[PDB]
Structures are given as structure tokens and as C-alpha cells.
Amino acid sequence: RMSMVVSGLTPEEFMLVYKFARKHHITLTNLITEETTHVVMKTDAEFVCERTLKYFLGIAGGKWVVSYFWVTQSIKERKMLNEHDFEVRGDVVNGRNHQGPKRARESQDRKIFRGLEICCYGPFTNMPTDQLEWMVQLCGASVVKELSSFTGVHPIVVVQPDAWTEDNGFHAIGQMCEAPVVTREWVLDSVALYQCQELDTYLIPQIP
């Protein structure tokens, strides 16, 4: 059963989709759920979009991340067209051609954070923590809510360094535990490409 969500759209563009969903009897919602099957992204001609929360979750959920052109060209062609040839090809940050969305729906047997325990620590800005934790959960990780509450499986500390007011503070997590401390972008890039990226580029140096 088709359940749809929109991202990156102007109000008049949303109105098109609302009309299109009404014609074909497809559920369109404002909030992304587990029940949601399709995330409809605004892209350019190259099927390249921007990174939104809905975009990340669409990949992490293994959902049909689809360009909004799939709506407009199906309006023009009068029939409801195939999702395969309208799936988004990548994003403005990580790559115009990484088939992130395709590789996520393809590999659900293997999920990118298969054996990791992830704890978010300290302040966070634009993305709700409970959402980023869900995204991490969606790629088959374990969410830990306290630094002491870690458990033959690997721990990772996730931090957003530009949210900290006393910037000397995010080098002090190595004192509390011996687990690695990466930036928030490690999660975000890894979900976007749907490949677990090597922590080396994201690793925050800790104080001895």
C-alpha cells in the first residue's frame, strides 16, 4: 500500500502532489512514518537533491526515494509511471551519482551499521536527536542513551562540535570512555551513500 511524503517543495508544488495523490488514491502525509513507502524529493534534471531529514530517513528506511519529476511527468503522461526510472541519483553534498537510495533498498539483508553501539553526546542543532537516533536504528545500530551504558560489539560516540559553547569540552569524552568520538557528519554521509564510512576522516582527537 502506497504511502507518500514530500521534501523540498514549494507550496504550489505540494498542491500538485496533493492533487496527484487524490487522483490515484495514494496516501500522502506530512510526517514520515515507518508505514511510508515513498519520499518525493525536489531534484534538478540530473535527479540530484539536497540533504534533508526526510531524505536521510528515506534511505535509512530503505524507502523509494524518488524525484518530484515522477509526479510531473506522470501528470503529463496521464498514467502513473515506474519508480525505477525516477529514483534519485544522489545529493548535492556527497555525490551526484552515488546511487545511495538504490543501494539501500537493494541491501536490507546487510545494513550499514550492523554491529555498532552509538551514543549521541552533548548539544545538537538542526536535526532532532530522537530522529538521528532513529536513523541510526534504521541502519541496524544499537542506541545507547548514556556514556556509562555501553556494553563483543563496537561502541561509537557521535558529537556535533559546532553546537558546543565551551569548545574545549568535546575533547574530554576520551576521559569518560575509551570509545571513538566522531562528528555528526559520519552518520549523515554514511546514510547518504549507504556505506559505513571509515571513521578516520571524522575522528575528533581526544585529550590524554
Binding site: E50, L53, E185
Partner: peptide
Amino acid sequence: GAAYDISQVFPFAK
């Protein structure tokens, strides 16, 4: 058109 709120983008960052 009028005043509409807009969902976050996640640009390049360290």
C-alpha cells in the same frame, strides 16, 4: 507566495 516555513537542508560541514 506568502510566509511559509521551510525544512532544513544539510550542507557541507567539517
